[PDB]
Design a protein around this ligand. Structure first.
Ligand code: HEM
Ligand SMILES: *[C@@H]1O[C@H](CO)[C@@H](O)[C@H](O)[C@H]1NC(C)=O
Ligand SMILES: *[C@@H]1O[C@H](CO)[C@@H](O)[C@H](O)[C@H]1NC(C)=O
Ligand SMILES: *[C@@H]1O[C@H](CO)[C@@H](O)[C@H](O)[C@H]1NC(C)=O
Ligand SMILES: *[C@@H]1O[C@H](CO)[C@@H](O)[C@H](O)[C@H]1NC(C)=O
Ligand SMILES: CCCCCC
Ligand SMILES: CCCCCC
Ligand SMILES: [Cl-]
Ligand SMILES: [Mg+2]
Length: 325
């Protein structure tokens, strides 16, 4: 279906309402590495089993959290292209599931958001690196470090100052402990953006002060649960303030080279100075590597989702066509 348009009415409102009650997981219900999508599924803004169309996801993040249209479109079609079923139009917000329907040929994985190294990546705040055995479950130890960083840099609250320090700490942790640590291209970009989302979107919209309390933080991060009487943000936003997180500890993109403490800058990687290159590499390398020689119906689905992806890309970039026009 078409990418949904922006909200007609973007006002703060109760989103923990009678039609969107929190419910616990039933057997087969899928939750993954994204606390935003997890919460929308656990409140029935998405299907509660955690399998959704891109249009459902875009409508969910806008209606539930006032995620802005451009950011919703970019992230959703990126995730769908590398992790979703392009024929069925279904994406798992977590583990690989037969519920996304018959699989395309390898090397395409359709592994859901749990798929390491497509969208999901290292130095997550409350999820472990894939190397340590679990890239998707809430980690209490990592959350306790989030609380500690909030206590130290945020006076008990998670804010952009806390985001800047924790983002850097998680990178340094992965460099020290994950011999396979990768922090390039798409992950480099999204890892910074993600640290702003709690401050911008998990803060009750009646306050919108960028100060996330730890009761609200645990409710979202661990239980996929909006606070009682949660109001969504009062205006559309996504990553506003990412500049403060970067400026706190500017990092070059790079990877460990098969050993801990071997972080090596990748001059082939995009960085914040080459945003269009991040888009071009995502399409020409990541998507193309998953679908090198697509059949006619997969090629059509790819080109449609790649057009949709480009709608989410900031003006100034040229669209690239790996399967022609
Ligand atoms: C619009 C479509 C969205 C997609 C496709 C998406 C996808 C993802 C994925 C795959 C991750 C895991 C990346 C990683 O840490 O390895 C992630 C992380 C995250 N997402 Fe989402 N997301 C979306 C929207 C949102 C929204 C609306 C929010 C908040 C309201 C949000 C909050 C977060 C946060 C806080 C994390 C970081 C978790 C952590 O590092 O502990 N996302 N997102
Ligand atoms: C927008 O939504 C808010 C919150 O529900 C509501 O109070 C307001 O009346 C709505 N505005 C319009 C123009 O309907
Ligand atoms: C959570 O993260 C900590 C530190 O990274 C790690 O020791 C632990 O194994 C992870 N998983 C669980 C199951 O607590
Ligand atoms: C985070 O909170 C601390 C302590 O209240 C404060 O010094 C800092 O300015 C805050 N940062 C932001 C961006 O609100
Ligand atoms: C992507 O491929 C297009 C079309 O061939 C080309 O113009 C562009 O330079 C490529 N970009 C990258 C980053 O390889
Ligand atoms: C929606 C984010 C756009 C960034 C890519 C240039
Ligand atoms: C959601 C804002 C853009 C993050 C990736 C460039
Ligand atoms: Cl918007
Ligand atoms: Mg991760």
């Amino acid at each position: 279906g078409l990418p949904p348009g922006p909200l007609e009415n973007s006002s703060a409102k109760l989103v923990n309402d009678e039609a969107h009650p929190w419910k616990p997981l039933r057997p087969g219900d899928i939750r993954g590495p994204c606390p935003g999508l997890n919460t929308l599924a656990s409140h029935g803004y998405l299907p509660r089993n955690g399998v959704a169309t891109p249009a459902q996801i875009i409508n969910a993040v806008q209606e539930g959290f006032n995620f802005d249209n451009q950011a919703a479109i970019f992230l959703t079609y990126a995730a769908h292209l590398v992790d979703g079923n392009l024929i069925t139009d279904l994406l798992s917000i977590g583990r690989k599931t037969r519920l996304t329907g018959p699989d395309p040929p390898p090397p395409a994985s359709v592994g859901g958001l749990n798929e390491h190294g497509t969208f999901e990546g290292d130095a997550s705040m409350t999820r472990g690196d894939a190397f340590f055995g679990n890239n998707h479950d809430f980690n209490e130890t990592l959350f306790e470090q989030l609380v500690d960083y909030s206590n130290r840099f945020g006076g008990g609250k998670y804010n952009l100052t806390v985001a800047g320090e924790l983002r850097f700490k998680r990178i340094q942790d992965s460099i020290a402990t994950n011999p396979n640590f990768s922090f390039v291209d798409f992950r480099f970009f999204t890892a910074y953006g993600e640290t702003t989302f709690p401050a911008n979107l998990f803060v009750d919209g009646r306050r919108d002060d960028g100060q996330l309390d730890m009761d609200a933080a645990r409710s979202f991060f661990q239980f996929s649960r909006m606070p009682d009487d949660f109001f969504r943000a009062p205006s559309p936003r996504s990553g506003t303030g990412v500049e403060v997180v970067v400026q706190a500890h500017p990092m070059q993109p790079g990877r460990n080279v098969g050993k801990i403490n071997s972080y090596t800058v990748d001059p082939t990687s995009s960085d914040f100075s080459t945003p269009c290159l991040m888009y071009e590499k995502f399409v020409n390398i990541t998507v193309k590597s998953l679908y090198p020689n697509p059949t006619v119906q997969l090629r059509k689905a790819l080109n449609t989702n790649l057009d949709f992806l480009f709608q989410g890309v900031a003006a100034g970039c040229t669209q690239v066509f790996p399967y022609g026009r």
